[PDB]
Each structure stands twice: as C-alpha cells, then as structure tokens.
Design a protein around this nucleic acid. Structure first.
Ligand code: MG
Ligand code: MG
Ligand code: MG
Ligand code: MG
Ligand code: MG
Ligand code: MG
Ligand code: MG
Ligand code: MG
Ligand code: MG
Ligand code: MG
Ligand code: MG
Ligand code: MG
Ligand code: MG
Ligand code: MG
Ligand code: MG
Ligand code: MG
Ligand code: MG
Ligand code: MG
Ligand code: MG
Ligand code: MG
Ligand code: MG
Ligand code: MG
Ligand code: MG
Ligand code: MG
Ligand code: MG
Ligand code: MG
Ligand code: MG
Lengths: 206, 46, 353
RNA sequence: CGGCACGUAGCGCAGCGGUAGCGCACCGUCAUGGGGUGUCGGGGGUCGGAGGUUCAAAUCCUCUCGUGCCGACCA
RNA sequence: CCCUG
RNA sequence: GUCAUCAUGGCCCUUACGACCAGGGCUACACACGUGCUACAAUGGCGCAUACAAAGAGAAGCGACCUCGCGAGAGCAAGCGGACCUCAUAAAGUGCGUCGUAGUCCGGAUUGGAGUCUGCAACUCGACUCCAUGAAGUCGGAAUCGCUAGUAAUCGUGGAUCAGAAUGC
RNA sequence: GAGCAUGUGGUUUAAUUCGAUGCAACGCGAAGAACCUUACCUGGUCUUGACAUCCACGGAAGUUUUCAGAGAUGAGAAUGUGCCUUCGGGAACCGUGAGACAGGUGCUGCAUGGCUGUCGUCAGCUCGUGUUGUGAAAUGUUGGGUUAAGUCCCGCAACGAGCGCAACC
C-alpha cells in the first residue's frame, strides 16, 4: 500500500504551515509562483549551507523569510553581507520589500531534512549506503530521538535491479495523529541513476 | 560459412516451413531477472 | 518550384543509391574490357563467344550510358533551373520540367528493368504466412503479420483475397494462403520469401517473460496449369499377342520406354483403349514426378542456404526493425507493422536478394 | 460394352408437380483468468449441366459428363 | 477436461 | 500503471525525430463491447394556480430593475470582492380540469426551415430557442450488477474544467 | 432488447497522435479537441535556433505605418533615442557573427526516483533475548473462552518490543 504524508496529514494538528500568509483569489496564483521561485533560489545557493526549513510570510506588501538552518555563521558570512545580498535579490524576486531572519537549529541530525541531505551526500560520494544508514541510526539514538526510520530506494550499490532498504527502531507511530513525526525526502543523482531517501523521526507523543 | 544440417532430411514441399518446424527457428525461453522464473540459486559472481 | 527542388534532390539521391547498388565503375571496367577484346578480331572468328560478348556488351554499355546521361541531365537541369529562378523564363522552365520528367522516367525504366527482371514477376502470386513451432505467440504474430501484409497490398493497390486461413484455438492464425492479384505482384513481393524474428514482451505468458517467435512468408507465382498433350502414334509401339485371337494389346511408349499390357477383354479395341488410358495415366504420373523432383532439387538448394532464410528481425522490446540481408534498420515499429515496408522492399529489390 | 443406382449448403444425409429440410460446421453474445465443453441467437444451397412439356419443374422426360454395383458367358 | 517451451 | 505531469542512468537525432504558420485530423464507419441518460406510459402526459430546501460561485465576474422579443437573448442600467446584491422562480408534491389504454395529447430520435449567444471564425466540428416532422420502442434471451436505513429508488440544485461547449465527475 | 451520449476494439483514410487494455483498462490520463489547444497528416518556411548563458560588433527599449504573402515571414517609411554615470563609463532591451551548446510529448516503467491501483481497512506482519532441533527452522504468534480486531483474561519456555488494531483528527 501507499502511505499518506506525515506532515500532509498533520498540518491541522501539530505541524505548523511553512507558509502562513493570507491572500485573496487575485494574488494567490502568482503568490505561489513567487513562493516557488524564492524557495528554489534559496535552496540553490543554500545547498552547501545546511538548510532545513524555509518559512515565508507576507504581512502587507512585504516578505518575511525565516530560514531554519544549522550553520548560521556560514549563512551570514563576515558581518552579514551574504544575508544582505540575499535580502536584496529576494526583494527583487518578490517585487516587495524583504527581510530575512536566520534560525539556528540545534541537533542537525535530529532534524529530518539534514539527515536526508547527509545521506544523499554519501550516496553521491559513493560511501556504502548501508554503513551510512547505520551511521544516521546511531546518530539519532545517541542524540536521543524517540524513534527513527530511514528508507533508501533505487539502484543501491550500482545494482541492475532496484530495491528498497529501510531501518527502524523505537516507536514510529504513523497512524497516531498527535505524534511529532518530522518526515522528509531527498534524491541522489548518482552516476547509475536516481536514489530516493525518506526519513521519519518520532520526537514525542504531543 | 558452413551448411546447416536441417532435421527434416529430404524436403519435398517447402524448406522454409521445414526449417520453421526444425529446432533452428524455435521459440526461445528467457530467464527472468525477477518475476516468475526469478529465483537464482547462485549469482553470476558468487 | 519548391517541389521541383525537392524532386531534383530526390532524383540525385536515388541516382546515387542506384550507382551504389549497381557498382557502376566495376561494370564500366568490364564494359571497357569487352570493348577491347571486341576490338581484337579473333572474337568474331569464334561465333558463340562473340554471341555472349554482344549480349554482355549491349547490357553494360546501356547501363553505363544511362547513368552517364542521368549525371549530365542532373547537372544541366540544375544549372538551367538556377537560370529559370532568376531570369524567370517560363518557356525554358517548362522545358526544364519536361526534360526532368523524361530523365526521371528513363531512370525509372532502368531501375524497372533491374527490379522486375524475373520471368514470373508480372504474374499474380500466392503468399503464405505460417507460424513457427512456438505456440500462441507465434500464432498472434502470424495473424498480425497477415494484417500488415493485407495493409501493404491495399496500399499498393493489389487486389487481395484470402484463399485459406487456418486459425489457432486461442488467438492468431496458424497459417494463411492469400491470392495477391495485380500486375507485377510477384515481382514486388518476391523478396519476402523467408523468416521473420519477433522479439516482444509476450502477453500470453503469465509472467510477462519476453518471447522470440518466428514466422515465414513464402510467395510463389500463379503458374499456368498447361494442358497435357496426347501421345503420338509413332511415339507409341503397338503390339498384339495371344491372351494368357491375339486380342492382347501391349502399348509401348518408345522415347521414354514404358509399356502397358491388356488382355482381359475379347475385343482388341477395348484392350487397346484401356492400354491407351494407362499410357495417359502413366505419362501424367511421370510428369508430376518430374515436377516434384525439380521442386525437391530447388528445396535442396534452399535448404542448403538454410539460415539465410531468416530475413527480417523486429525487436519490439528495443523497438528496432532490421533487414539482415540488406542490413538496414529503422525505429518506427508501429509504421513497419502498419505496412510501410516500401523502403525495405526497394532496398532488397535493388540488392537483388 | 449392356443394364441400374446417385449427383441436394463447406461436409454427411432426407425431400422426388406449387413448401427446399436435419445434423456437424461458420459467425455474434454469454460462462471462464483464458481455451474447450456448455447456453442464447442468426445466416448460408444455378437442388450436377443443358433443353423439352406443362400455368409452373429439384420432383416428369431426353441427352450429357462424373462415381458406385451387377454381368462382358458355351465354345 | 486443459494451461506454449 | 506512469520515461506523455515532473526528475533521471543509458541509447538515438542535431539544416532534423529540433523550431514557426495555415488547413485538415484527434468527432470517420459494414461491425462488436463497456459505462451512462431518456423512454416504452394513467403511481402518468398536458394545461392552470400555489407551498417546502441545502450547499456553492462571482471582478477580463455575478449581473438585479425597466423595455423589446413567443423564445433562446438583446439595449439601458443598480448592488456585490458578498450571512447584504446576483446566479436563483427549485422540482417531485398539493388543488382542479382533460386525456381513457391507443404506438396514443407516451416517446422525442431523425430531418427541413428560421434564429440567439460566445468566439477572429460554429462547414468538417458548439450549445441553446422557435416552427415543422414524429423513428425504434408496448419492460427486453442466455446471462449479469448495485444496495441493510435516511440506504436503495426517485426529484431537482450548485461547483471544478471553461470565451462557448455535460446524459461525465 | 430500443434510441441517444461517451469510451474502447476493429476497419478505413493523410492522420484517425500517444498511453491505460482481467477483477485492479474501457464517461480512463482528458476537471471539458472549432483555431492554439495536440504531441498526428498535408503544405509553406528557419537552423547557436521558438526557449538560456558566454564573447565580439552596431545600437535605446520602445511607438505609428506601407506593400506582398493564407500566415510564418521578406522588403520599405515616419516617431522616440533614454537609465543611472570616475564626459573611462557601463546594463533593461533589440539584431548580427560563430561555437560551447540549447532541444525532443524520440526509445527503454524489464535500468529508476517520485506518485498511484490491487489483494484490503483484510487482521495480520515481524524483531530482540532466551530455549528446543545437527539443520532448514520452532517458541513468542499456539490452548480455552471473548471481540469488528494478534482486542482482552487466564494457562503456557517463553519473557519483552515494534509496524499494524483501537484512541488522538
Ligand atoms: Mg491513500
Ligand atoms: Mg469354360
Ligand atoms: Mg491437450
Ligand atoms: Mg491499473
Ligand atoms: Mg505499458
Ligand atoms: Mg496548426
Ligand atoms: Mg477522443
Ligand atoms: Mg407526451
Ligand atoms: Mg462555479
Ligand atoms: Mg413498432
Ligand atoms: Mg400501452
Ligand atoms: Mg441528477
Ligand atoms: Mg462552462
Ligand atoms: Mg511512449
Ligand atoms: Mg486510441
Ligand atoms: Mg499498449
Ligand atoms: Mg467512472
Ligand atoms: Mg485545431
Ligand atoms: Mg513538414
Ligand atoms: Mg514495474
Ligand atoms: Mg543450539
Ligand atoms: Mg501468524
Ligand atoms: Mg511461527
Ligand atoms: Mg486463540
Ligand atoms: Mg496488538
Ligand atoms: Mg501466550
Ligand atoms: Mg486506526
């Protein structure tokens, strides 16, 4: 069977929206076009700077962009010229005045996005996928996640036949709605094809 | 270039259909990598 | 004038293809040689080798001057077309159209004489599809091959009718004999004698394992069933002898050497009439045995060539069509199985296979 | 050679002054994963050829060319 | 009743 | 199942399998199948009068009122980015009259003429209105499907797509 | 069974684009094909290019036009010639010149990711440690009752745990 998205079923319960503006029908379509543009551009030039979440909001004819990342020092650079130029370019992109807050994220391997980025990095650099999966597993258990399940899919190890390998421990209660299941995916464009990774992290009952 | 030995012997009506009903033009079985004829006892390199 | 440009380009391309298939320089070499030993006069001191030299000389020189005058026609029609585009001389452009049509028709006559060189090529044909030893997959492949050949026959304009069609119980047809009528049908379809190699993901198999089935297309012209001529009184030897009146009749055909006796009836005329019917029956039997022996000899030769019967290969898994004899390839499997084999049959017919 | 028996749909067979019939088979739909069997519903025949009578000819007659049978015996 | 190698 | 949402290993093409425009096609037709709508009628048809909803949409939009037109619609022109205005008068029902079992005052296919609207443009190939015509169909073989309660069955209404264009969702 | 709508197969044509084609394809992708739509055909055109970047050169960008052509397009005529600026400048944007490349709804779902159908919202699927068997393995999960449920009680060489069930929505 196919699974429902943990975030996608838990927006109304425990997971905050990653876009919390309001719009009428007139500005909605090009509004989401603007959100897609800003998100692809900031992930393009924040790909090497350990980005986790991008939460953007339009108060009134302006854009607040909060970047949840794990390396705010390399985000801001040498007294903030990096975030300043990102602010001016995103103001150019959205057509409105812009301001950006950087949120430092404790426990980056307790974050789900960075685990996906790490695992896709070793699958690019040809580190053995099973070892890297275990390495993420003791990362989660050592920093005290209540549960984690990692899944990798595709032509693992250059095999001719694709397959799926998933590791699990602790509790991963997908059917319990109030659970904090932080879930995220990523892809690897390996020389032998596309390798998909999914991460489920259970971080508590409520 | 060597002659083929057809198993129909002396063909007196039609040799093209004779070579069809010879084992040369037989229908051939493919070993599936996965599916029905899927199981391999030993690998190619193991 | 854009169809004129495309048409001159098409004539140039098909002329180059014709030169490549005909090997023009080699035939020109034998033409020059045959001209040389014609120039030495001993060749007319021997009669029959001069007969052969005249035959080969005429053929080689005709092909050579044909290809030469098509080269000259291509270049001067191109130059005068370049004149007619800018100067806009309408009568001279019409002259270009007329001479271009004449050159095209005359090269068409040349390639015509090459491709329909068979003595039975003009007649209608019996074309047969038979599936291999595979099973229902080969049955389906034979049936849809029959569909494709019907589509080709209707596209060409040949009149088709299904003489017999033995079907399979599950799907497809096991064998089918088709009368393809129309002018030059056997000549058009004579390159199809042989084996087709289907490779496709079989639907009849439960696991979706791909299957490699085979089918044969066998075409033969509608030969005239000639009347069996009666035997001659000099060719017969008639004897009468006493039955075991000398009413017993022994008729002997002398040039072949076969006798029939008849002694059961008191009437010598009745004995002779039964002996004459025996003569006619044995002559018909011997003619059938001679025809079957010649057919068996031809089958010995074509069983000797054997593996060469595998003429066509359709890889529907990788979606490629291959004629192994001419070696040609294409990717449009749906067009090929729709019946667009014109390029393949023209390649085979210019090859002469 | 003389009789006498039959030429009916693709096949096997009935009908022998006004009507063309049965079975197998072919087609279409159901039933089955699919094939067979099964169920439903259809169609198909210059009545061997020719010409004579009769209002009308498969049926009556003549000839015809096929296949079968019985006799072609005393010397 | 059967299930192309 | 999807390389035709997208992404992507390999392979193929690069004055062409790439790119532009116009016209045609995707709507054809001896036939077979699937899923639907409307019927074969009186528990109904037709005519007249009069009750009772819920949900949703609307700015290159919904478009009231008034006038013209039998009508589809047209002209002028309020309100509404909306519990306010419009779509929008719900129908089946109820009351009365007629029809009186007939291929019928059932059916509404097909076809002819005359129009309205959108859109550059309605012929291939739109929807709707009027007038005219009135086909098969009298409940359907083997077989087969849905449904345990506000369900089946029936009667209407709205929305997405959308310039226009539902018996579909 | 009938008429019609719609999809499919087959047929035919230039094309009737392609994909789905047991249940789990067949009012399906398509929540809507008159042109574009659309990948199909015919005809007419182009090739660093309809869609990006790089280098060099000439320039504003833009705004009205005329002719021919079905149009793409080709040629011609008027108006603007800025924007910020070390009168060094320089780029929004128009053409040209090449090549590095762009491009494909071209092939492979039997190389894949992602996403979905299906058995089936069926109640199962396992693991840790322990024990038994040489071993594949077994126990746990079986037994007696109970429930929509491997839900629960007790017994039990099993003791615990997880995805499932349930609840939280
Ligand atoms: Mg779901
Ligand atoms: Mg005697
Ligand atoms: Mg058998
Ligand atoms: Mg499916
Ligand atoms: Mg497929
Ligand atoms: Mg067009
Ligand atoms: Mg269609
Ligand atoms: Mg009525
Ligand atoms: Mg609406
Ligand atoms: Mg009737
Ligand atoms: Mg009635
Ligand atoms: Mg309704
Ligand atoms: Mg609409
Ligand atoms: Mg495809
Ligand atoms: Mg189709
Ligand atoms: Mg297919
Ligand atoms: Mg449906
Ligand atoms: Mg069109
Ligand atoms: Mg073209
Ligand atoms: Mg698959
Ligand atoms: Mg032990
Ligand atoms: Mg169990
Ligand atoms: Mg067990
Ligand atoms: Mg129990
Ligand atoms: Mg449990
Ligand atoms: Mg127990
Ligand atoms: Mg539940």
């Amino acid at each position: 069977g196919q699974k429902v998205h943990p975030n996608g079923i838990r927006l109304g319960i425990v997971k905050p929206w990653n876009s919390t503006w309001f719009a009428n029908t007139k500005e909605f379509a090009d509004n989401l076009d603007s959100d897609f543009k800003v998100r692809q551009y900031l992930t393009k030039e924040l790909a090497k700077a350990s980005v986790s979440r991008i939460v953007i909001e339009r108060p009134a004819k302006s854009i607040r962009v909060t970047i949840h990342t794990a390396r705010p020092g390399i985000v801001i650079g040498k007294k903030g010229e990096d975030v300043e130029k990102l602010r001016k370019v995103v103001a150019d992109i959205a057509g409105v005045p812009a301001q950006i807050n950087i949120a430092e994220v404790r426990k980056p391997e307790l974050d789900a996005k960075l685990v996906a980025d790490s695992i896709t990095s070793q699958l690019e650099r040809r580190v053995m996928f099973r070892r890297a999966m275990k390495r993420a597993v003791q990362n989660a258990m050592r920093l005290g996640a209540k549960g984690i399940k990692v899944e990798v899919s595709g032509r693992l190890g250059g095999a001719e036949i694709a397959r799926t390998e998933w590791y699990r421990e602790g509790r991963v209660p997908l059917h319990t709605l109030r659970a904090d299941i932080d879930y995220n995916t990523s892809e690897a464009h390996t020389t032998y094809g596309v390798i998909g990774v999914k991460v489920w992290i259970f971080k508590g009952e409520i | 270039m060597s002659r083929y030995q057809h198993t129909k012997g002396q063909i007196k009506d039609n040799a093209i259909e004779a070579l069809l009903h010879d084992p040369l033009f037989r229908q051939r079985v493919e070993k599936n990598k996965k599916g029905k004829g899927s199981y391999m006892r030993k690998g190619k390199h193991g | 004038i854009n169809p004129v440009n495309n048409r001159i380009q098409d004539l140039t391309e098909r002329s180059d293809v014709l030169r490549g298939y005909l090997d023009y320089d080699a035939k020109k070499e034998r033409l020059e040689e045959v001209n040389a030993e014609l120039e030495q006069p001993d060749v007319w001191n021997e009669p029959e080798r001069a007969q052969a030299l005249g035959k080969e000389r005429s053929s080689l020189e005709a092909v050579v001057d044909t290809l030469d005058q098509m080269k000259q026609g291509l270049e001067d029609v191109s130059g005068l077309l370049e004149l007619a585009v800018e100067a806009d001389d309408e009568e001279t452009f019409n002259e270009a159209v007329a001479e271009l049509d004449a050159l095209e028709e005359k090269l068409a006559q040349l390639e015509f004489r090459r491709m329909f060189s068979g003595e039975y090529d003009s007649a209608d044909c019996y074309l047969d599809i038979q599936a291999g030893s595979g099973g229902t997959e080969a049955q389906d492949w034979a049936s849809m091959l029959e569909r494709m050949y019907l589509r080709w026959a209707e596209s060409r304009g040949f009149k088709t009718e299904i003489i017999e069609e033995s079907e399979g119980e599950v799907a497809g047809i096991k064998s089918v004999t088709i009368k393809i009528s129309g002018d030059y049908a056997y000549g058009w379809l004579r390159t199809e004698t042989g084996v087709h190699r289907l490779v496709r993901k079989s639907p009849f198999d439960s696991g979706g394992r791909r299957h490699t089935s085979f089918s044969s297309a066998f075409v033969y012209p509608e030969v005239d069933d000639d009347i069996d001529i009666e035997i001659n009184p000099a060719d017969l030897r008639i004897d009468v002898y006493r039955t075991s009146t000398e009413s017993a009749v022994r008729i002997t055909h002398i040039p072949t050497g076969i006798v029939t006796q008849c002694q059961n009836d008191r009437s010598q005329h009745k004995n002779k009439d039964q002996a004459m019917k025996q003569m006619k029956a044995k002559l018909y039997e011997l003619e059938m045995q001679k025809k079957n022996a010649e057919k068996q000899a031809m089958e010995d030769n074509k069983s000797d060539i054997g593996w060469g019967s595998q003429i066509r290969s359709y890889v529907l898994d990788d979606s490629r069509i291959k004629d192994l004899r001419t070696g040609v390839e294409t990717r449009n499997t749906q067009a090929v199985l729709d019946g667009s084999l014109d390029q393949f049959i023209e390649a085979s017919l210019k090859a002469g296979l």
